[PDB]
Design a protein around this ligand. Structure first.
Ligand SMILES: *[C@@H]1O[C@H](CO)[C@@H](O[C@@H]2O[C@H](CO)[C@@H](O[C@@H]3O[C@H](CO[C@H]4O[C@H](CO)[C@@H](O)[C@H](O[C@H]5O[C@H](CO)[C@@H](O)[C@H](O)[C@@H]5O[C@H]5O[C@H](CO)[C@@H](O)[C@H](O)[C@@H]5O)[C@@H]4O)[C@@H](O)[C@H](O[C@H]4O[C@H](CO)[C@@H](O)[C@H](O)[C@@H]4O[C@H]4O[C@H](CO)[C@@H](O)[C@H](O)[C@@H]4O)[C@@H]3O)[C@H](O)[C@H]2NC(C)=O)[C@H](O)[C@H]1NC(C)=O
Ligand SMILES: Cc1nnn(Cc2cc(C(F)(F)F)ccc2CCC(=O)N2CCC(S(=O)(=O)c3ccc(S(N)(=O)=O)cc3F)CC2)n1
Ligand SMILES: [Ca+2]
Ligand SMILES: [K+]
Ligand code: NA
Ligand SMILES: [Zn+2]
Length: 805
């Protein structure tokens, strides 16, 4: 109930939202059909348009007017944004040659520079280039401020998950808003774009920026706007609040535009009709900048211009239908469109089996424009599994395509020419970021970065402590003039043992054979030092990784590689080695094919054994340091140590071998040496975090050898490729992957062909940031470099996407 007979006199766009049944006057009141009778008259004034004209100068204040040209207006805060241009001989902000803003130039009474966040739905990153002639104010911001060529959204690339990620620094699995549509099985509640359930606070986790400020004594303007409040009014309100007294005036503000998203759905991202909506958005930016200039705040306030996702060409005729794959199509519910989520239509139906459904959806047509996944098998970079609102079955759809349940759904709900929601690495989904103001750099380009990082920077700009989040705080210090956050490296929890030779060959009862009994004081000392770490400086370029949990491990030195061996997990947590540009691949010799040698530094009881691999008909093994790349035939024996052995399904061995035997050498040629650090990952509960001993769901038949869910590699080299990896003076260059450790290759539709026609494509799909790998392993890399720690953090968050420019 709304007893809508209160008034809105003196309450227009109130910041404290009042309780039912008192009628409201806030910027969300319309949305909830709850405004006071008089809200349109008193708060949605439109008389005389939005611009002063010569005749209006010095007029008599008339309260019915939308915005004022009377003399008194500036103090009251309610001038038309163009008043001084028209009435007082001044220039538009856009026509002034831009000047460095070395310090905040604010009125007295201002305790910090305020932040204004100007967010625009569906503002594709290529619009900054392709629409620059029609967008002069945004063009000024970008070139005079700090800007990235693009900003990476989160998956799925939809409006709600992305705006709430910007607000929280959380992945959608962690903040709760995993779609524009959602079913929560715990509540038995659905969440939709239309309707009222999206207003319940039980959907919205984390701590968004506005609460973070409020909780820490910093006042926030309300971020949300009802769709019917025109843009010119939203701007006027923000300029009004900025004119408020020091103890009431908010320090943070948000503007939202529904364009260009709304039109690009109708006409496609580059439709000829899209020029006008870009013209309007720019003009809205110009009004704001002229307004701030009038209040002498244009060189005080930090402005952020950011989008939520981009936009792709998609039409009705490019729709895949589950009805052409499944006989049983009426027993499933599908969340459709540019992604696919499948659950049982009725949970009473016990015949429902996701495994059978995935099978019926797996490489059935030659050019299939979607791929089905158990959510735990989705690329770990999407971070889209750990939430009960994400259905066990997922369809990643090809860019440009839709999935629907049946034809009737597409022609009984062609209209749309553009859509979004695809994989967050697709170019057409990339969006924008510009920062402008005293706390941001001048005329600076920054590399591409993820929107999960912004929450922290917005806290840094307002002097707030961030709530815990998925940002890596300090990875974006290179955007800022000052207020940088200066983090320290996490302290190492477990320190490594360095075991020597303590065990005799005959103590080991492994079932492991090896034809190695092939016997001097030059070479006997030579290889002891190798076993003491004389080549570590060759293979451990950036320090050893710190283990940030409590565990028991040993550092093992060898000629060609170094490893940190886990006594709890009976295999390495990490293995480091350097291949130079000049290096050679050799075969495995025949005397060694199925050879495994005991490691005399590591007890039998902390070692794997070949008999378990023999007895496990499903499982086989591989090596982390590839025997293929050993330096010399004496050194190749070291690669066959039981402590370099890991469990590998045969299916995945085709992948591993291809990477180990072909790709590493290629990268070493292309990049002028590479450092490589590889290991296993265990994420049986798909939280993207390192599993403990007791979360491991699978061991090799009849042993304590745990089975990885994935395998990672971090490939590092010099950014200036003229210097080789082992001798690099400047910034570094990295690419990493987290490959799923799967018993078949159903994920790769060309997998019956030669590995050169599919493996490199699989790796690309499972590209990763070093920081993803850190969370999953409980390690911290790049501890000892000449580089600054903020530059290392930036490097750690980097993702190699394999998309063209
Ligand atoms: C991305 O960044 C985020 C932000 O930090 C990371 O997420 C965190 O991960 C932490 C570790 O997994 C997790 O810490 C846990 O907190 C539990 C209490 O949580 C409540 O309070 C916090 C703080 O205010 C709040 O933020 C939480 O909000 C979650 O839940 C609500 C549901 O109402 C959602 O609205 C909200 O979106 C959020 O959901 C998300 O997180 C939860 C996990 O907490 C997921 O389940 C959801 O799917 C979703 O992703 C909560 O309201 C606390 O219970 C945990 O402690 C258990 O385990 C420890 C082991 O050390 C043990 O000591 C405790 O006793 C306890 O176990 C007991 O309870 C168990 C269940 O009954 C039982 O199994 C045991 O036997 C015991 O009885 C734990 O400390 C933290 O909450 C989340 N935060 C968020 C916001 O998600 C995320 O990891 C980052 N991602 C990456 C890749 O790095
Ligand atoms: C979604 C979402 N998540 N966070 N935002 C705010 C936002 C953030 C950031 C930015 F960039 F800074 F983070 C910038 C800008 C915004 C404003 C977004 C906006 O104005 N709209 C239109 C109205 C819809 S709504 O009507 O569906 C709606 C949803 C939730 C809530 S609640 N329960 O949390 O109060 C009430 C509500 F009215 C949401 C999108 N929107
Ligand atoms: Ca885990
Ligand atoms: K086997
Ligand atoms: Na296949
Ligand atoms: Zn949209």
């Amino acid at each position: 109930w709304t007893a809508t007979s209160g008034s809105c006199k003196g309450r227009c766009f109130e910041l404290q939202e009042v309780g039912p049944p008192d009628c409201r006057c806030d910027n969300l009141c319309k949305s909830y059909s709850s405004c006071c009778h008089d809200f349109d008259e008193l708060c949605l004034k439109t008389a005389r348009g939005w611009e002063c004209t010569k005749d209006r100068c010095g007029e008599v204040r008339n309260e019915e007017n939308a915005c004022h040209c009377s003399e008194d207006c500036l103090s009251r805060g309610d001038c038309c944004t163009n008043y001084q241009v028209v009435c007082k001989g001044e220039s538009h902000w856009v026509d002034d040659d831009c000047e460095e803003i070395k310090v905040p130039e604010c009125p007295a009474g201002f305790v910090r520079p305020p932040l204004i966040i100007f967010s625009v739905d569906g503002f594709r990153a290529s619009y900054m280039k392709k629409g620059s002639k029609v967008m002069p104010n945004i063009e000024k911001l970008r070139s005079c401020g700090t800007h990235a060529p693009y900003m990476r959204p989160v998956y799925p690339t939809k409006t709600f998950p992305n705006l709430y990620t910007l607000a929280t620094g959380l992945y959608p699995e962690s903040h709760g808003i995993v779609g524009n549509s959602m079913y929560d099985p715990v509540f038995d509640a659905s969440f939709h774009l239309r309707g009222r359930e999206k207003f319940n606070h039980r959907w919205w986790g984390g701590q968004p920026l506005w609460i973070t400020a409020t909780k820490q004594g910093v006042r926030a303007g309300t971020f949300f706007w009802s769709v019917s409040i025109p843009h010119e009014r939203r701007i006027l309100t923000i300029l009004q609040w900025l004119s408020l007294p020091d103890n009431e005036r908010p320090s943070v503000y948000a503007f939202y535009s529904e364009q260009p998203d709304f039109s690009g759905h109708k006409y496609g991202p580059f439709g000829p009709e899209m020029t006008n909506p870009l013209r309007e958005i720019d003009k809205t930016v110009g009004q704001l900048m002229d307004g701030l200039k009038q209040l002498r705040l244009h060189r005080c306030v930090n402005v952020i211009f950011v989008g939520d996702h981009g936009m792709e060409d998609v039409t009705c005729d490019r729709t895949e239908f589950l009805s052409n794959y499944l006989t049983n199509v009426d027993d499933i519910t599908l969340v459709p469109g540019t992604l696919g989520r499948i659950r049982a239509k009725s949970i009473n139906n016990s015949k429902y089996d996701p495994k059978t459904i995935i099978a019926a959806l797996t490489c059935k047509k030659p050019d299939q424009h979607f791929k089905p996944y158990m959510k735990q098998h989705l690329p770990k970079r999407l971070h889209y599994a750990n939430n009960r609102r994400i259905e066990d079955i997922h369809l990643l759809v090809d860019r440009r395509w839709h999935v629907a349940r049946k034809p009737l759904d597409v022609y009984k709900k062609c209209f749309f020419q553009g859509d979004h929601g695809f994989d967050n690495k697709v170019n057409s989904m990339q969006t924008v970021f510009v920062g402008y103001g005293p706390t941001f750099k001048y005329r600076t380009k920054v590399p591409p970065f993820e929107n999960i990082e912004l929450y922290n920077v917005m806290c840094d700009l307002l002097g707030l402590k961030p709530a815990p989040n998925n940002g890596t705080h300090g990875s974006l210090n290179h955007l800022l003039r000052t207020n940088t956050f200066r983090p320290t490296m996490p302290d190492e929890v477990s320190r490594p043992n360095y075991p020597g030779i303590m065990y005799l060959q005959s103590e080991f009862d492994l079932g492991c054979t090896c034809d190695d009994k092939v016997e001097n004081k030059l070479e006997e000392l030579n290889k002891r030092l190798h076993t003491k770490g004389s080549t570590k400086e060759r293979h451990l370029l950036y320090g050893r990784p710190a283990v940030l949990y409590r565990t028991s491990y040993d550092i093992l030195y060898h000629t060609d590689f170094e490893s940190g061996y886990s006594e709890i997990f009976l295999m390495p947590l990490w293995t480091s080695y350097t291949i130079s540009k000049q290096a050679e691949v050799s075969s495995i010799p025949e005397h060694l094919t199925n050879c495994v040698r005991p490691d005399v530094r590591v007890s039998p009881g902390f070692s794997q054994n070949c008999l378990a691999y023999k007895n496990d008909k499903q499982m086989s093994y591989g090596f982390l340091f590839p025997p293929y790349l050993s330096s010399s035939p004496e050194a190749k024996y070291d690669a066959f140590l039981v402590t370099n052995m890991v469990p590998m399904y045969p299916a995945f061995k085709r992948v591993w071998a291809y990477f180990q035997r072909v790709l590493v050498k290629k990268y070493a040629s292309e990049r002028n040496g590479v450092n490589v650090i590889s290991g296993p990952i265990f994420d049986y509960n798909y939280d993207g975090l390192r599993d403990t001993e007791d979360e491991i769901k699978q061991y090799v038949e009849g042993s304590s050898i745990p089975v990885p869910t994935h395998y990672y590699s971090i490939i590092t080299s010099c950014l200036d490729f003229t210097q080789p990896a082992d001798k690099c003076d400047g910034p570094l260059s990295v690419s990493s992957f987290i490959l799923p450790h799967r018993p078949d290759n159903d994920e790769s539709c060309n997998s019956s062909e030669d590995e050169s026609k599919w493996v490199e494509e699989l790796m690309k799909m499972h590209t990763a940031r070093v920081r993803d790998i850190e969370h999953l392993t409980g390690l911290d890399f790049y501890r000892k470099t000449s580089r600054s720690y903020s530059e290392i953090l930036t490097l750690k968050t980097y993702l190699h996407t394999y998309e063209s420019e």
